[PDB]
Amino acid sequence: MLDINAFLVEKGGDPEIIKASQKKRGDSVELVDEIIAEYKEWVKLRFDLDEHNKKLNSVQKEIGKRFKDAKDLIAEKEKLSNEKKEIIEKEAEADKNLRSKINQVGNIVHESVVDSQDEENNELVRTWTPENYKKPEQIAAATGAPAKLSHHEVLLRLDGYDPERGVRIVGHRGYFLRNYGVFLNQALINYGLSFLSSKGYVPLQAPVMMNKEVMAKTAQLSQFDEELYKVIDGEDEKYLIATSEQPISAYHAGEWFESPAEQLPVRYAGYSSCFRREAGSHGKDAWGIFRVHAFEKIEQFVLTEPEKSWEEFDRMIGCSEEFYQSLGLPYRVVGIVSGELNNAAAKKYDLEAWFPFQQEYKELVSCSNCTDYQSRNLEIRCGIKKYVHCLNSTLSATERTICCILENYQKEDGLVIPEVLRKYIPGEPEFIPYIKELPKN
Amino acid sequence: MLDINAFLVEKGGDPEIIKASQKKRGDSVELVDEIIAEYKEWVKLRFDLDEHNKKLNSVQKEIGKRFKDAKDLIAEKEKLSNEKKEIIEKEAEADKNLRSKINQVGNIVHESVVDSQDEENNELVRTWTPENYKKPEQIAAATGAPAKLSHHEVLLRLDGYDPERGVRIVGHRGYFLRNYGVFLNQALINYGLSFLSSKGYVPLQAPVMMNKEVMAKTAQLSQFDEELYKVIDGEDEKYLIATSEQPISAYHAGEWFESPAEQLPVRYAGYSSCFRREAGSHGKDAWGIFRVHAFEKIEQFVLTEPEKSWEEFDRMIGCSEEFYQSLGLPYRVVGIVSGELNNAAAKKYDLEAWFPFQQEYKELVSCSNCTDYQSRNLEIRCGIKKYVHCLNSTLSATERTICCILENYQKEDGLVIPEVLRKYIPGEPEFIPYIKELPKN
């Protein structure tokens, strides 16, 4: 969340900036005034508590002297004490409601972000096409072949996954990966780790379960509602993670980078499976492994000094671009409109790759600067309270990245294996043949 | 479960064999007599239902004729019908209780299994040591160095995992893998897949969630009690899998290998994460990644003709032995006593590898022939009811396999990388240095 003092003009903050941000977000502007009011009530209670302590100390110090009368001093002590009890209770309630309200306020939207609720207004930041690919159309970028099949059709013809047995065993969107489906997924995981490791990222495999209290410090309420699976463990509960961002953001909770010039930035190549209920996503992207309930993801997670996060943000999206360029996948980078930012993000870029069968750009990567919104909550201090900035960016959500590869590397008789992945696959195949026909053809 | 007819002498079965097996298992022998009694009650009801149908048909066929009187035929129809209703209800209840009882009976213990409740009596099947390793002692097998550190100490000195941040974020046994911890885990996963794929196994990545009704057909009750995590999905529930054995065993549920000579055996190299509450395991193996709540495992899963399963069982444990030999890890293979077999297993071998710091053999692999116990429940038919046999065997539970490597590949200044894994790790290191000191030293 934002610092309390950010709401307080008298403390150096600017509530106006916060209201403007709320407006850009399409979120409550009223929250800001309410937060300010409750803060003043809290301060009043704190002063009153202070005064009662002063009176109490004065009174019991008098009782000591008249200990030589003194049922009146006692009568007042009991009075002041009873009042103090009440004040103590109100203060704690006020602090609670104040923090609850502040928790609802999204991070300050960066001035460079387009103010809109309509993704049609996403900023077109950059476009990239591979060599020998004239323009985005219904043509597999890597092979030049007609993009005749969708990703799920390609994967079926390759005998690379099993949605039918998947659905019977797990329910909707359930799947097994098979044969080269497994090998390609592993290839992306290992290439991704190797790729980031070469750039100084530390490989970090995160647990996929988190304690509720920790999850609550890094995920917003809406995620608990329609995103996260709850785990029952005897009499206890945990959550399954939606992204390694969650546990890795808490990795340095309560720690202090007290010599940041030498200690930061810290860069993690996160790897985990990810689990999402997709509770608001019915029917959309029904077949294939494009949108599923469980998937693997190589994540960039970085902590930097507050003064260096914006440069790091550029470095991180640049890292993902280089990764997709290395796979020969056409893409565009877009600046997400204010109305589509989650609470933690001050700025977000998505990399959307070209799917030639769909003939559409589809999101493969989100890259966010969350400044100190999460680190304040997790108490991750920086230097000299000053907190580190946290940024996160997809490197590769592997099953969805496979979908993009499938459409762009297809040809008449099968699938060309992207050159950079070959060394990660037994036999280092350059090409794998279609094994099955589609029922429809 | 076993076939109903197995309990019925008149149907060609031998209840005596089943009672002897129950006794070997240390399980209820009474169950068998009860199952036989309830079957007879069920048969009685079936005959009575049959007779009522005959009478009813006779009666309503008379009512048709007197339709030319006839309130007596009607009075009897209503009588017979009311009786039939009751019989129908009793029959269904009997069938239910009969199957419930049969479900409690473990598979027939193979005659070659030692009859005992005490693992001290496990059969010592085979022992193996690598080259230049005289005998199992407190010496790292691969390097000849003193086995000075436990697996968790080695992993800590390598900065290869983080149990402290793991515990804070997930709770007891929680961990992150870091740096070469991640690379070694991936190395084992990919080597294992490549290894089995070269032997004709089909790589199959299983989903880690299963519908309750399907899980119930392959897991025994005790697993639901202290092993499986339940998942909350809105108003629905699923289970997390304890092993890819579970979903892969259900992969061919309701299918029919009608030309088994050509269609079987079918061999899967299963890969998944695995989740276990270890609810009955408090404090034991407290530190390290030897016994954890989440781990990866490459699994052998095979379906064969009933007449070929015993030969396949030998092939499968042989495959695992070859795998550990290739890693240079000393081990023994033991025939598990009858009293330690789960319900599905007719026979089980464990491969237990030498941990030189612990100076003990520790289980890394279980290999089981479950004959047709699971396939009967999942309706996986074979030829010409005749069901396939199912077998399963660990190839590598990767985190625990890492523990064995750590103790056996340690030397004074760090860890030698097993030769076969080198190609799976960026830089193909032959050795990685200790990075941190232990607090205690």
Ligand SMILES: Nc1ncnc2c1ncn2[C@@H]1O[C@H](COS(=O)(=O)NC(=O)[C@@H](N)CO)[C@@H](O)[C@H]1O
């Ligand atoms: N037809 C293909 N077969 C295999 N890999 C391909 C194919 N097309 C593109 N790629 C992969 O995608 C990457 C980007 O390809 S590219 O944009 O066309 N450029 C190049 O190929 C060269 N600039 C470098 O190889 C390549 O390095 C290659 O690994």
Ligand SMILES: Nc1ncnc2c1ncn2[C@@H]1O[C@H](COS(=O)(=O)NC(=O)[C@@H](N)CO)[C@@H](O)[C@H]1O
């Ligand atoms: N339900 C899903 N199925 C398959 N892939 C998904 C699913 N949801 C998200 N992804 C993939 O994972 C990527 C990152 O997810 S995200 O929600 O957008 N952002 C994050 O999780 C951040 N931690 C950055 O990775 C998406 O861009 C998409 O490529």
Ligand SMILES: Nc1ncnc2c1ncn2[C@@H]1O[C@H](COS(=O)(=O)NC(=O)[C@@H](N)CO)[C@@H](O)[C@H]1O
């Ligand atoms: N000191 C070591 N360094 C790296 N790898 C080792 C070491 N010791 C054993 N291994 C691995 O474990 C395997 C089995 O080793 S062995 O039993 O001693 N036998 C041999 O090394 C030879 N028979 C084949 O290399 C070897 O193939 C090797 O890959």
Ligand SMILES: Nc1ncnc2c1ncn2[C@@H]1O[C@H](COS(=O)(=O)NC(=O)[C@@H](N)CO)[C@@H](O)[C@H]1O
């Ligand atoms: N809690 C755990 N933590 C780490 N590894 C475990 C844990 N439980 C089991 N394993 C590893 O997984 C292996 C197989 O597990 S098993 O329960 O014995 N058997 C199975 O699951 C069978 N499907 C065969 O693999 C064990 O031999 C052990 O090496």
Ligand SMILES: [Mg+2]
């Ligand atoms: Mg928002």
Ligand SMILES: [Mg+2]
């Ligand atoms: Mg996104």
Ligand SMILES: [Mg+2]
């Ligand atoms: Mg038993």
Ligand SMILES: [Mg+2]
């Ligand atoms: Mg076992």
